[PDB]
Amino acid sequence: KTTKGVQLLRGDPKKAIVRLSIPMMIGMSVQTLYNLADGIWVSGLGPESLAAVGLFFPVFMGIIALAAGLGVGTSSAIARRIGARDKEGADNVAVHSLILSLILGVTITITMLPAIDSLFRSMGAKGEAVELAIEYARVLLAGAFIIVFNNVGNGILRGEGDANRAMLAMVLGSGLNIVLDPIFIYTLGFGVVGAAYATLLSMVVTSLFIAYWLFVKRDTYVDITLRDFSPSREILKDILRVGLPSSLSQLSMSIAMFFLNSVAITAGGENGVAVFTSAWRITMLGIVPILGMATATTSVTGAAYGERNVEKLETAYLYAIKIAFMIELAVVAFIMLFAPQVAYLFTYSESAQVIKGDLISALRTLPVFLVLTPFGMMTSAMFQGIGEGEKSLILTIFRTLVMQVGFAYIFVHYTTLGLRGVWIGIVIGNMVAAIVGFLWGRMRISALKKTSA
Ligand SMILES: [Cs+]
Ligand SMILES: [Cs+]
Ligand SMILES: [Cs+]
Ligand SMILES: [Cs+]
Hints:
The chain contains 18 helices and no strands. By secondary structure, it is mostly helical. The chain has one domain (1-453). The longest helix is centred in the first third of the chain and has 37 residues, at 47-83. The chain binds cesium ion (4 copies). It is a multi-pass membrane protein. Its main location: membrane. This is MATE family efflux transporter.
């Protein structure tokens, strides 16, 4: 009466990390290929049409930070019960989270829909760029509960080791969205608002398959049934303890990106922001694989934390850092060698402004930080696995807003490095946060050996 995702989740910690990471890397690859190709479609629409997405993109990131945030907290809570062999509790958590996905998604829609016209006019935009963004937001905000349900539902699969179907749910939504984008935007001539319907229909098809697995097939490990009674303020707090900080982590990382561009303004003008933007867009080739192992670390370490197997937890937390470090080592060495080739496809295709000199030198300096992020992300994933999610938020605020932002402000205003000193500061800043992250992790690991012995 045990599923294969669960049996894999409770088994070998080293095997569970590899087996649950590879599906998550593939799913986010399709999500990255969507976001990559979508920009190529929307940019070829016009000037005031490209600004309409720019006004809504922060609103989109905010909703995703809430949906995926609630998804991470749900996945962790279910993973700890399954580790503790508390299926009745893991069932109650799955029902609790699905009820929250309905409450949260409706709250996002009733809140945002009024405060849209006043929000998009705050940046001073007016006319077509505002009216398009208002219509573009009216589409994706009408189906907010689908975005939350798709994230919570995907988290219920990852919580019980079902990373396979949790990957399929991602490739189904993003795959259709890659296909539906040029058809709705160009072939049918819907325009920029067509990209909001391609996303909506894609997430609608995904929601049906998730609901088909959770309520019709019911082949998941958890029993999602409202038949009995168990409203738990304890479970509600346990889900939100990882949920709310994970959302604020995305906000903290976002605010940190806003300051780095303002430092890139002072460092090397306006295209220095474009060189900066084109630089970290390339580093997504390395951030995506880590995000995969981050989702697997949370469910594996949480499964060990629920099983009260601290050695299994530590063996998993260290193995996740070692594997991620070697995958980035290959990614960094690949991007750093063929850097003039990666920039060739990123800046010279548009002969409107050549910025190959600064982007190439940044690709030999910035991707150095990709080998240090596993020390901070696996730590954040391990704090989320054991439930102590506020520690992941503290580690993120220190890494982004303090170390990376601080080292970039100092290496520009108080040195002669200039624009290249921005990438120097982010690497050195992330390097100091790697020490703090990796040490905080192993320090938290030992505290649980004391509590159990
Ligand atoms: Cs988008
Ligand atoms: Cs509607
Ligand atoms: Cs079941
Ligand atoms: Cs200066």
